[PDB]
Amino acid sequence: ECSVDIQGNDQMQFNTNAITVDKSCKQFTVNLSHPGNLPKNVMGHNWVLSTAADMQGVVTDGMASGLDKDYLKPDDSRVIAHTKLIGSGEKDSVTFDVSKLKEGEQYMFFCTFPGHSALMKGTLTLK
Ligand SMILES: [Ca+2]
Ligand SMILES: [Cu+2]
Q1: Is 111 annotated as belonging to a binding site?
Q2: Alpha carbon distance 23, 28 (integer Å)
Q3: Ligand nearest to the CA of 96
Q4: Cβ(11)–Cβ(41) under 8 Å?
Q5: Cα-Cα-Cα-Cα dihedral of 92, 84, 80, 16, to 10°?
Q6: SS (H, E, C) the chain
Q7: How far is Cα of residue 76 from the mean position of the Cα atoms in its chain?
Q8: How much distance in Å is there from the Cα of 46 to the middle of ligand 2?
Q9: Which of 5, 46, 47, 79 has the fewest beta carbons closer than 10 A?
Q10: Which residues constitute the domain of residue 18?
Q11: Is 82 among the annotated ligand-binding positions?
Q12: Residue 82 maps to which CATH number?
């Protein structure tokens, strides 16, 4: 109930492209880990959640903020929730309120490390 375990690996892949959140959930938790051996500054990953329309800007601003900010704009109002940036062998979790999500909206999740969102993205939907 109300959580998903997700991996980002050394091939610039997340192990899901569609996350389902049961609608009765008050808080939803994403548990990110990084198998593999590459360090954070070479193939670090985070998990970041925004509306479909906000994704591109979150990504572009993230790249501009740089590594030392985990490739995310500090207090970006468009980020519904995010993990830390992690490298191999690390993990991080985040929990966010399900009330921050609305029926009929389309949410995307992605990694903001530069370039990774080309393949490391997917949908998040209420079920
Ligand atoms: Ca945390
Ligand atoms: Cu990544």
Answers
A1: yes
A2: 10
A3: 1
A4: no
A5: -60
A6: CCEEEEEECCCCCECCCEEEECCCCCEEEEEEECCCCCCHHHHCECCEEEEHHHHHHHHHHHHHHCHHHCCCCCCCCCCCEECCCECCCCEEEEEEEHHHCCCCCCEEEECCCCCHHHCCEEEEEEC
A7: 14
A8: 6
A9: 5
A10: 1-127
A11: no
A12: 2.60.40.420
The tokens describing 42, both together, are 């070479």
Total Cβ atoms within 10 A of residue 44:
24
Pair of tokens at residue 22: 């049961």
Please enumerate in sequence order all residues whose Cβ is within 8 A of that of 57, keeping only pairs 6 or more positions apart, or say none: 78
Task: Write out the two tokens for 35.
Answer: 């198998």
Q: How far is the CA of 127 from the centre of ligand 2 (A)?
A: 27
* Resolution of this structure in Å: 1.6
Q: How was this structure determined?
A: X-ray
Map tokens 């091939």 to a residue: 11
Domain count, the chain: 1
Residue type, 124: L
